[PDB]
Design an enzyme around this catalytic site. Structure first.
Site, PDB file in Angstrom:
ATOM      1  N   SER A 105      15.184  -8.984 -17.370  1.00 31.87           N
ATOM      2  CA  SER A 105      16.397  -8.460 -18.007  1.00 31.87           C
ATOM      3  C   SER A 105      16.927  -9.509 -18.976  1.00 31.87           C
ATOM      4  CB  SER A 105      17.362  -8.027 -16.904  1.00 31.87           C
ATOM      5  OG  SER A 105      18.451  -7.307 -17.456  1.00 31.87           O
ATOM      6  N   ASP A 159      14.051   3.300 -17.088  1.00 30.80           N
ATOM      7  CA  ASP A 159      15.114   2.308 -17.174  1.00 30.80           C
ATOM      8  C   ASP A 159      16.235   2.821 -18.065  1.00 30.80           C
ATOM      9  OD1 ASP A 159      16.682  -0.042 -17.384  1.00 30.80           O
ATOM     10  OD2 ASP A 159      14.886  -1.308 -17.517  1.00 30.80           O
ATOM     11  N   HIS A 191      15.396  -0.353 -13.651  1.00 35.63           N
ATOM     12  CA  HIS A 191      15.726  -1.726 -14.025  1.00 35.63           C
ATOM     13  C   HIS A 191      15.619  -2.628 -12.797  1.00 35.63           C
ATOM     14  CE1 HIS A 191      16.999  -4.389 -17.175  1.00 35.63           C
ATOM     15  NE2 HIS A 191      17.892  -4.943 -16.372  1.00 35.63           N
TER      16      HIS A 191
END
Length: 210
Positions: A105, A159, A191
């Protein structure tokens, strides 16, 4: 030969929370490797209305879509800290091609920025569910050797935190920059990190070590 793996956590997370990732890399080739899981400083985060948390660089907007605003200056500050880690490991005797940078991320965005701005070719950058944290204006500043570092980009198709479309957008950016990127899509993944995703990263690092 000594292998070094730097893992960069995501927004609000920490290094120690992610250190057990290394226990999922059980191959004899990777159990020898030296890992480092640093922790980002406590910074205000714009997407959380200035709330303070561990954050590598400021994130104006989350979920991240194609076209979401980015804070390029802040990313470039974070790259300096990552580069100091890499410089030290190489100076201490590690071959640059045995250095791998991975992150999830926000940490994947930082991974991308750090690898592409490093003056030497590294073993590789593994981006997990990241995004490109600067515009094409930075490409002129990518060092010659950095463009030879391979990128493995892993992203879940479902996601909605960092849209799959934003991960796909890295591909024309990397092609414009002259960078080799393997893109691995994970159907139904959101995610997060899946074990099969980590196992593939391990296989990719082993192949790069050759």
């Amino acid at each position: 030969a000594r292998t070094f793996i730097l893992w960069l956590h995501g927004l609000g997370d920490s290094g120690p929370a992610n250190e057990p990732i290394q226990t999922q890399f059980k191959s004899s080739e990777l159990s020898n490797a030296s890992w480092l899981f640093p922790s980002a400083p406590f910074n205000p985060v714009t997407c959380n209305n200035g709330a303070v948390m561990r954050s590598w660089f400021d994130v104006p907007e989350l979920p991240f879509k194609v076209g979401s605003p980015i804070d390029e200056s802040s990313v470039l500050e974070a790259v300096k800290n990552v580069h100091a880690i890499i410089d030290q490991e190489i100076a201490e005797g590690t071959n640059p091609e045995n250095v791998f940078i991975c992150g999830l991320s926000q940490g994947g965005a930082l991974t991308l920025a750090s690898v592409l701005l490093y003056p030497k070719t590294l073993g590789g950058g593994a981006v997990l569910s990241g995004w490109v944290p600067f515009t094409s204006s930075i490409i002129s500043q990518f060092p010659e050797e950095a463009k030879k570092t391979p990128i493995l980009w892993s992203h879940g198709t479902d996601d909605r935190m960092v849209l799959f479309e934003a991960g796909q957008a890295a591909l024309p950016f990397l092609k414009e920059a002259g960078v080799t990127c393997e893109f691995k899509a994970y159907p139904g993944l959101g995610h997060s990190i899946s074990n099969k995703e980590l196992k593939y990263i391990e296989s990719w690092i082993k192949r790069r070590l050759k």
